Amino acid sequence: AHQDALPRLPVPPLQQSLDYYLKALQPIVSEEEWAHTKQLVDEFQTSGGVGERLQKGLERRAKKMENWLSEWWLKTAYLQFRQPVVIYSSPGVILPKQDFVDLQGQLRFAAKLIEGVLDFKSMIDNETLPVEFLGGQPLCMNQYYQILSSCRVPGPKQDSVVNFLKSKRPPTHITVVHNYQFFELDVYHSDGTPLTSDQIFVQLEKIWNSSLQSNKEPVGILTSNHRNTWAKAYNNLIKDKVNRESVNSIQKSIFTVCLDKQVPRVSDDVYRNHVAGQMLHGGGSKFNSGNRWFDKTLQFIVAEDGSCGMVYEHAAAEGPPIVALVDHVMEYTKKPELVRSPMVPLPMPKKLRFNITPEIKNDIEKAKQNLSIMIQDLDIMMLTFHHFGKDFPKSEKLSPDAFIQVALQLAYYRIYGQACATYESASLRMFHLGRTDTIRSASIDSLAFVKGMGDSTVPEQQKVELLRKAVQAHRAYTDRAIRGEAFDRHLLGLKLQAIEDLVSMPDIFMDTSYAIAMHFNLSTSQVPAKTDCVMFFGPVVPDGYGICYNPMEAHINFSVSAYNSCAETNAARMAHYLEKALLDMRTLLQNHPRAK
Numbered sequence: 001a002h003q004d005a006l007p008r009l010p011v012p013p014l015q016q017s018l019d020y021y022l023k024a025l026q027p028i029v030s031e032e033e034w035a036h037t038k039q040l041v042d043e044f045q046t047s048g049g050v051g052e053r054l055q056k057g058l059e060r061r062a063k064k065m066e067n068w069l070s071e072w073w074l075k076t077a078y079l080q081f082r083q084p085v086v087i088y089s090s091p092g093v094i095l096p097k098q099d100f101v102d103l104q105g106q107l108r109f110a111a112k113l114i115e116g117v118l119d120f121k122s123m124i125d126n127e128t129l130p131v132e133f134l135g136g137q138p139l140c141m142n143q144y145y146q147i148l149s150s151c152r153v154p155g156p157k158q159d160s161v162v163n164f165l166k167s168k169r170p171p172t173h174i175t176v177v178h179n180y181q182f183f184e185l186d187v188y189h190s191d192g193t194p195l196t197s198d199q200i201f202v203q204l205e206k207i208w209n210s211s212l213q214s215n216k217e218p219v220g221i222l223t224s225n226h227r228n229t230w231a232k233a234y235n236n237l238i239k240d241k242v243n244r245e246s247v248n249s250i251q252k253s254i255f256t257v258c259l260d261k262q263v264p265r266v267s268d269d270v271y272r273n274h275v276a277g278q279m280l281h282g283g284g285s286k287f288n289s290g291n292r293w294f295d296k297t298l299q300f301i302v303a304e305d306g307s308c309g310m311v312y313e314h315a316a317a318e319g320p321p322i323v324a325l326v327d328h329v330m331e332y333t334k335k336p337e338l339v340r341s342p343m344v345p346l347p348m349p350k351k352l353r354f355n356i357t358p359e360i361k362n363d364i365e366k367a368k369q370n371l372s373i374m375i376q377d378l379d380i381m382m383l384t385f386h387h388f389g390k391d392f393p394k395s396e397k398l399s400p401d402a403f404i405q406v407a408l409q410l411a412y413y414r415i416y417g418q419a420c421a422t423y424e425s426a427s428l429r430m431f432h433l434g435r436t437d438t439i440r441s442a443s444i445d446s447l448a449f450v451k452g453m454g455d456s457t458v459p460e461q462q463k464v465e466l467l468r469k470a471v472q473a474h475r476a477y478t479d480r481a482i483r484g485e486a487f488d489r490h491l492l493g494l495k496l497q498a499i500e501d502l503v504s505m506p507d508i509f510m511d512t513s514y515a516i517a518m519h520f521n522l523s524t525s526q527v528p529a530k531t532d533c534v535m536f537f538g539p540v541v542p543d544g545y546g547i548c549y550n551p552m553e554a555h556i557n558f559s560v561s562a563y564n565s566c567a568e569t570n571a572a573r574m575a576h577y578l579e580k581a582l583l584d585m586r587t588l589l590q591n592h593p594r595a596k
């Protein structure tokens with residue numbers, strides 16, 4: 001019912017979107033390229049022209065679909081993306097490290113975590129999940145019904161997603177992975193009531209005792225290979241009815257809990273970078289990468305040393321829904337303990353065995369090698385910005401997110417001497433089934449600021465004005481994006497409509513400017529959470545960075561990724577300039593108060 005009250009995703013006017021496109025191109029293309037693109041744009045949208053016909057097609061699409069973009073986005077952004085989901089697609093999460101130092105503790109926490117999720121699942125199944133608002137406007141809650149009991153399934157041409165949340169007989173079990181071995185653990189009684197952390201611990205107890213050794217092949221590492229490869233290996237792996245039975249149990253499970261094995265202690269100054277690696281990819285074949293199933297939508301990882309976190313498959317959802325679950329859970333794991341009545345000799349969790357063959361074993365070794373290369377090429381720098389958080393920008397009446405994005409443009413320019421196409425996730429949840437759109441952080445105003453900031457001929461009195469104008473511009477772009485007025489998904493739609501209409505690919509899309517515009521050297525997102533956590537992901541281009549952050553009141557958690565194969569990029573350096581950019585902006589604003 002709530003969804004029927006939500007407005008439908010609009011199709012922006014053609015002229016509106018193209019005008020914003022031309023403006024966003026100015027700081028990243030040459031004068032000559034911009035001029036040429038201006039011509040193509042005028043032609044493209046002329047009355048009775050090509051663009052007008054494609055626009056009408058989109059308007060017809062919105063009239064005959066719940067959300068004109070949904071299917072196209074899911075397919076284009078994820079299902080047709082054939083690179084491994086590991087690092088390149090599935091975001092990782094680091095949660096507040098826990099205190100436990102022994103096995104019974106780890107299982108105790110793991111057990112508490114499970115109960116927390118089920119508590120959250122209650123509102124989902126019962127549809128009692130509080131209605132969220134952005135500011136007087138209702139938000140789509142569909143993403144919350146895609147994360148549990150779901151899984152990505154390899155496809156020879158494109159992948160697919162399975163969701164058992166609303167099936168005839170919905171799954172009532174989760175999968176636990178310990179020492180590369182999977183187990184099927186039911187978390188509900190025949191009566192319907194879910195198990196308690198105690199009963200669950202008793203179950204987790206039996207599971208650990210039934211997997212005390214690690215000498216099995218890491219079948220799960222197969223899910224980390226190229227999708228074309230995993231598609232073939234998967235198809236084979238499931239020929240054996242036992243394997244197919246296990247794989248099926250995994251895909252149906254409410255979610256996967258990974259009880260990771262102890263790993264080598266590292267120096268404190270690189271500890272977080274390592275924990276990030278463990279959450280994003282596992283660390284390698286001889287660590288915890290095999291203790292996974294990357295096709296799974298929600299994977300909660302409870303490490304040995306007390307660290308904890310997760311990694312989720314992106315086709316299934318976005319960050320916000322994930323953090324809402326994380327916040328609810330991390331809080332639940334802190335609640336008191338009273339009624340601890342004695343359970344019963346609960347049934348034992350079924351083990352998900354795998355019959356390995358020379359062919360399957362070979363694919364496992366091919367996967368280990370592929371992942372090994374991927375991990376060695378990833379450069380990650382985790383940065384805890386302790387200087388300030390949302391507090392400072394708020395004290396200047398500036399949007400913290402906009403302040404942060406402008407700082408990143410400053411950091412990038414200080415390193416490369418030029419701006420670059422920049423992507424920032426914008427939530428389209430105020431619309432039915434809305435996912436995301438793109439906020440472009442490289443703008444006419446941000447370029448003017450970063451240039452003025454380093455120009456010794458520009459007085460500080462002027463620099464600050466340029467700073468304020470850049471932040472307000474980003475905030476404006478952000479407000480338009482969230483209200484369906486950005487242009488990136490729109491242009492994508494026009495291109496896909498052309499493909500569907502069987503008409504020659506419009507020149508505007510073959511244009512050099514468009515190519516430059518869609519090559520994001522900076523791919524970013526803000527994932528706010530009450531929980532002091534942080535997410536991270538790999539760059540979207542060879543020569544780019546993947547930056548994610550969670551601004552807290554007095555500090556900001558940042559993650560910076562880059563590829564070693566590209567000499568021009570360095571996570572540590574980008575992180576350093578970012579910290580300094582943020583500091584210099586504070587100094588400049590402090591030096592020139594609007595009043596007094």
Ligand SMILES: C[N+](C)(C)C[C@H](O)CC(=O)O
Binds near residue numbers: 523
């Ligand atoms: C990670 N990144 C920014 C590439 C993708 C976002 O997580 C989702 C989106 O913006 O569609």
